Write a protein that binds this ligand. Structure first.
Ligand SMILES: [Zn+2]
Ligand SMILES: [Zn+2]
Ligand SMILES: [Zn+2]
Lengths: 86, 250, 499
């Protein structure tokens, strides 16, 4: 028996932006969000509108709304979020 | 002739002198025909050779695609472009130097822009400085190849500036803003010089992205860039006690 | 003569009379003074040096010989001072010797020389070659010595270093650092040492690190320290990031129960010099896999768009040896933690069993086993303690430490001379990209230039960072040839073409 007591760890973060994807849920923009993967056919499957900020970053409306419920900055550039499309 | 030049493409080294002499005969035999002296050469050989090289490099590009990533595909395509540039010089007439290689380009790079333009994102935004140079010298030959790479670089520079000039400390915001935009400008001017040959298209993309990122309006606020850049000069030209010798401020 | 031309003339002729009196005693006999300037400088006679400076300042070609003689004297004095240095304390002694020479000569210039821009520039030009002593067929040891000096004084030590003493030492250190002329090498070496100091907690105070980075930024600008400040910020933020992670796990639907502890140090990728190049396809143990998964979920939810490259050679956990009648708790890297948790399965273990469980490379596994047997935590059944095809390793229950908490890892030091070679290689690579940028910019702006002017402008432009070499410039030219960004003129090979 060897009980670990601490795991002081080091990890390198790098930007993982891939083309035509939603950064919050790591899912495609046109496809539904990871919150709407459940009850896939219950709704109209159109309320997952593509929200574009003034910084030209495309997320899902549910994803960016859940992000803005806690943090008011865009995930991919740490700048304040401003809707300009839908 | 087409079969033996294809054998030269397949790795073997045939008799260069014999092939070049036979190909040169088709244009030397018409030297006394001053009206269209190369029409026989461009009718008997150059058009069949162009068709053969197009139908060969189409299959070659399709074969390269099935077993190579886009990072390796562009270096292989550049290798075959260089090999065709060399082998069309020791075999063909000078007038056919450019027609053949334009068939080599618009079969491996122009036919697969949808393959090479879908990778301009993962290559530029990861600063793949070798793959970026390969894809630049690959898409430069094609007419409508660059205006997507330029846009992807402009998006990358815009986001890099936005990340750099954000959440700056309010104590030294005027200096931090200017120095952050300056380091982004320096990094993406040396990338454009070393990797993308310093084109005015890519530097115009850099200028557009930096103009978009310096002049970023906060939500329901005014652009603080002029105020910050005036405070930079005010704090820099004042008689500060942190050194600032004159030839450094200049 | 000044007095008797003041009292016996017109004020318009004050300057002509003294000009004629000078250029009859101190410009006609210029050789008589230039033959003794060397003596009075290399012997440092105060009154004679002051008088000769006063005499030769007014004459046109009076100072340059004296300036050159003082520069040669400072060059020889600095070379004599930084010649026979004890290797035990060489990084400190070299910088202190250059500081002593600089202070003595700047006081000599500022007191008996009516301190001049030309003479102090001569002191700077002499000390630049004093510090950059390229030994025959050797690389410049100055940037490594300076980086090691900063590392030695900024690290936690029991020698005794008050904060004020460190602050003034680093304030005076910049007067040596500004002479270094190899700032790429110093930047890479300081980043390499600062990474270890920040990660392993060796820094005495992060205020000192912020102050040193500020000093280097003042000395060179916000592109020398553009990545050192990111390295410092990513460690000043990690406390708040770990607080956010603890809030995340304590604000979940169920009980998360990581189980042990967690002190993650998430770092930037482009800022830090660290890399996953020495990868071994390490298999994270079961007792850490849950915590890795939970932090991956947290970081994918709270910092979107970022991927983590978990560095395992820098992870340093703590393990309790309660199996072997616990004498202490070992501060052990996760590489050796994996093989110790494989030892947890059974008393005996084989090399192939370790390769199957931890999935590490042969070299990393060998290094971990060697580090464990050096501490004698485990023992080898075979007489040959080195690894073999099977090499059945056993558990040494006899070994017991003399402390209640003993650290078995040593990664804070030994400096890995292979990493020094890699650092110099990365320096050369960055130099090559800088030279390529300069060459492409010049050959696009001008489109026609020869070898001599191009080399001179490259040396003039790139001198602020490093000293360029003709071989490196030719290598960059060949690289641009390979990338079809440059050619040479058909009329003359001296000129160059462009695409
Ligand atoms: Zn989404
Ligand atoms: Zn949804
Ligand atoms: Zn954004």
């Amino acid at each position: 028996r060897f009980e670990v007591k601490k795991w002081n760890a080091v990890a390198l973060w790098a930007w993982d932006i891939v083309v035509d994807n939603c950064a919050i849920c790591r899912n495609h923009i046109m496809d539904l969000c990871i919150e709407c993967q459940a009850n896939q056919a219950s709704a109209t499957s159109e309320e997952c509108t593509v929200a574009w900020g003034v910084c030209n970053h495309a997320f899902h409306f549910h994803c960016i709304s859940r992000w803005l419920k806690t943090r008011q900055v865009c995930p991919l550039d740490n700048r304040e979020w401003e809707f300009q499309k839908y | 002739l087409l079969r033996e030049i294809k054998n030269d493409r397949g790795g073997e080294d045939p008799n260069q002198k014999v092939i070049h002499g036979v190909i040169n005969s088709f244009v030397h035999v018409e030297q006394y025909k001053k009206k269209f002296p190369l029409k026989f050469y461009q009718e008997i050989f150059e058009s069949p050779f162009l068709t053969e090289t197009g139908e060969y490099y189409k299959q070659e590009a399709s074969n390269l695609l099935q077993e190579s990533n886009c990072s390796q595909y562009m270096e292989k395509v550049l290798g075959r472009l260089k090999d065709e540039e060399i082998r069309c010089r020791k075999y063909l007439h000078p007038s056919s130097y450019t027609k053949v290689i334009h068939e080599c380009q618009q079969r491996m790079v122009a036919d697969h822009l949808q393959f090479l333009h879908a990778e301009c994102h993962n290559i530029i935004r990861q600063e793949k400085k070798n793959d970026m140079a390969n894809m630049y010298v690959l898409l430069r030959a094609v007419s409508t190849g660059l205006p997507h790479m330029i846009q992807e670089l402009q998006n990358h520079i815009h986001d890099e500036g936005l990340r750099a000039t954000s959440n700056l400390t309010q104590e030294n915001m005027p200096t931090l803003f200017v120095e952050s935009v300056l380091e982004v400008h320096g990094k993406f001017v040396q990338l454009i010089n070393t990797v993308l040959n310093g084109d005015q298209h890519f530097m115009s993309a850099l200028d557009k992205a930096l103009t978009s990122v310096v002049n970023y309006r906060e939500p329901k606020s005014v652009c603080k860039a002029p105020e910050l850049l005036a405070k930079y000069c005010d704090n820099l030209l004042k008689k500060s006690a942190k050194g600032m010798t004159e030839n450094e401020v200049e | 003569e000044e007095i008797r031309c003041r009292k016996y003339l017109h004020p318009s002729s004050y300057t002509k009379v003294i000009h004629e009196c000078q250029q009859r005693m101190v410009a006609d006999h210029l050789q008589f003074l230039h033959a003794e300037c060397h003596n009075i400088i290399r012997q440092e006679k105060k009154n004679d040096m002051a008088n000769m400076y006063v005499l030769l300042r007014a004459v046109s070609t009076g100072l340059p010989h004296m300036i050159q003689e003082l520069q040669n004297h400072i060059h020889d004095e600095g070379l004599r001072a930084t010649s026979n240095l004890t290797q035990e304390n060489m990084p400190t002694l070299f910088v202190e010797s250059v500081l002593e020479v600089h202070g003595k000569f700047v006081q000599l210039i500022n007191t008996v020389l009516n301190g001049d821009q030309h003479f102090m520039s001569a002191l700077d030009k002499a000390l630049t070659s004093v510090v950059n002593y390229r030994e025959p067929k050797s690389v410049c040891k100055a940037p490594e010595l300076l980086a090691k000096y900063c590392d030695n004084l900024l690290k936690k030590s029991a020698k005794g270093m008050t904060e004020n003493e460190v602050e003034d030492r680093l304030t005076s250190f910049i007067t040596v650092f500004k002479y270094i002329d190899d700032k790429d090498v110093f930047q890479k070496f300081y980043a390499r040492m600062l990474a270890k100091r920040l990660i392993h907690g060796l820094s005495m105070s992060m205020d000192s690190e912020e102050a040193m980075i500020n000093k280097l930024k003042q000395a060179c600008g916000y592109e020398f320290t553009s990545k050192l400040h990111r390295m410092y910020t990513d460690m000043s933020v990690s406390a708040d990031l770990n607080n956010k992670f603890n809030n995340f796990i304590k604000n979940q639907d169920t009980v998360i129960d990581l189980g042990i502890s967690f002190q993650i140090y998430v770092l930037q990728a482009g800022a830090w010099p660290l890399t996953q190049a020495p990868s071994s396809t390490f298999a994270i143990p079961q007792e850490l896999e849950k915590s890795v998964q939970m932090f991956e979920l947290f970081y994918s939810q709270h910092f979107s768009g970022r991927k983590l490259t978990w560095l395992h050679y820098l992870c340093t956990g703590e393990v309790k040896m309660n199996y072997l009648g616990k004498p202490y708790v070992a501060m052990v890297t996760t590489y050796q933690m994996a093989v110790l948790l494989a030892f947890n399965n059974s008393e005996t273990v084989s090399y192939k069993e370790l390769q199957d469980s931890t999935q590490m490379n042969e070299k990393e596994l060998t290094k971990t086993i060697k580090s464990l047997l050096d501490v004698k935590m485990i023992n080898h059944d075979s007489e040959k303690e080195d690894i073999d095809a099977e090499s059945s390793f056993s558990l040494n229950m006899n070994f017991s430490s003399k402390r209640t908490k003993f650290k078995i890892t040593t990664s804070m030091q030994k400096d890995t001379p292979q990493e020094m070679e890699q650092t110099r290689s990365a320096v050369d690579e960055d130099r090559k990209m800088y030279l390529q940028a300069a060459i492409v910019r010049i050959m696009k702006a001008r489109k026609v230039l020869r070898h001599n002017a191009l080399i001179q402008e490259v040396i003039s432009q790139s001198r602020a960072r490093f000293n360029p070499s003709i071989s490196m410039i030719k290598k960059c030219i060949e690289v641009l040839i390979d990338k079809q960004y440059i050619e040479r003129s058909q009329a003359s090979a001296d000129e160059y073409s462009y695409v």
